[PDB]
Amino acid sequence: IEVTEVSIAELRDALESGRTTAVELVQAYLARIDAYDAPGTPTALNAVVVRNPDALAEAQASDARRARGEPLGPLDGIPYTAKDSYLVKGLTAASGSPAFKDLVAQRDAFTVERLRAAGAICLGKTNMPPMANGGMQRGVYGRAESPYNAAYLTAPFASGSSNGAGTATAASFAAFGLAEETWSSGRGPASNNGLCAYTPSRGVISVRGNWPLTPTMDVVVPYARSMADLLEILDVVVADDPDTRGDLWRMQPWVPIPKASEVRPASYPALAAGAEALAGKRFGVPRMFINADPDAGTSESPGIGGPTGQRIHTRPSVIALWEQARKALEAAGAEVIEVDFPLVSNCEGDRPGAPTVFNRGLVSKEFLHDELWELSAWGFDDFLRANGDPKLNRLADVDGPQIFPHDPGTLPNREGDLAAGMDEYVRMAERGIKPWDRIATLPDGLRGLEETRRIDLEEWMRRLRLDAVLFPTVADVGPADADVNPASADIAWSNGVWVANGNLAIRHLGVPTVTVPMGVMADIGMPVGLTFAGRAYDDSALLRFAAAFESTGSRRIVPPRTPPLA
């Protein structure tokens, strides 16, 4: 059968009626990978970088269960891909880093455990920059290319590390995909590839067995081509993980975090709805993301580094898609209000009187320093210890200069020297790393982060009577040669483009989001998403809003570079 642009429900229907088998499905996806992804093909998208050699045997066992009339559940026999940061037992888990190219996973990540128990089949692992500490920079496997337009990047350049997952899921190299986000490494690639994606509130999906980057910020992010598929995934993966090791927010005792089983609904697929779910709702769109905020960037020295705090120049064709999205929401009975966005303005100090996260006093400068260094060094070292690969199980034994080497011939990283930056973590391990529960600044820091969200988002949405905040996921897309072309790098590194709209505040403060396709820019053929954000633990309502918006149109297209075969 054809698998291009086919939904999970259609696949399960085919498996149940005998129209196909799990083996036939795996072969159909591997065929697309071999025709479009592998080196030496005309497209050479280079999205899938590590194959699962047992995939066909796993498919065999799945069909044996079905012939015996006992499928494990709705995802039995459904193929997916996982970002190279996920531990998949028996395969390498380099996190795209040359220093870890031979590290082998001794167990599964929690997400993978749930999917394995459900009979889902990992076809392989997807591309990413070293340690997810970037966007489109080339790692040990290079980088992935866009299936929509070879001239533009498949993700934001500075934070879009799930760049293989975005290409692979949009090109139907599997039914769905698994990604991860620290700044915008989840929302970014979803936007450029027309995907649905969900960034959960804190503690909803265990991050055990996932390569950490910043333990206060890392979250799991599922990718799918439709909201219905996204809900199929969540139904299976969202559950309580009895093992808390490595998951900072589920280990810490100072901030109340609810159990996953307390946050999820009884049934995720039941969250789908039509336009009726938008009637009478109030949605606020930040002026700063629709070219309506002349005050952005008008303080004396705005930002907290890079292009932050600067006025965002949104592409005209993205504005045109936003206006149609607004009309669709209003036609469905919703109210869309242009508003400020304190969450970002008070993090980046972008206008007179606005504080920054560094000078506001809700979190201390020393906590922000420990977050970047001491806590992250502990994250790396404890992940290696927990995995327990006999050949490499301590951060102090790592080849520092090889963690994130610079790609020769490309322009410098505007965030600084990241090869030396990452090497410092090994020097730290050699001096001795304090565990997380002995870092003195942590208690006040975690409470300060939650306090910031309460003031800037939750109480703010109450007085405005907003049901959600929404905006284009990104302001523009960087050209594909932003790594070597100065003019292209200037665009790719500008605010709203280097990182998805929201910069660091979204993940730093634990804001749940859902992203769906907003359409395709008419001038360059690149997709752009619409992001819904809301109060912590309002995830269910946000998923429903996204599903309802999706139902009002058909805003996704098959990538023109990866058509159905034959």
UniProtKB/TrEMBL annotation:
Q: Which SUPFAM superfamilies match?
A: Amidase signature (AS) enzymes (SSF75304)
* One Pfam family of this chain: Amidase
What are the entry keywords?
Answer: Metal-binding
Q: Where does the source fall among the domains of life?
A: Bacteria
Q: Which InterPro entries match?
A: Amidase_dom, AS_sf
| Coiled coil location | none
Residues annotated as binding Cu(2+): 407
Keyword Zinc carried by entry = no
Q: Which protein are we looking at?
A: Amidase domain-containing protein
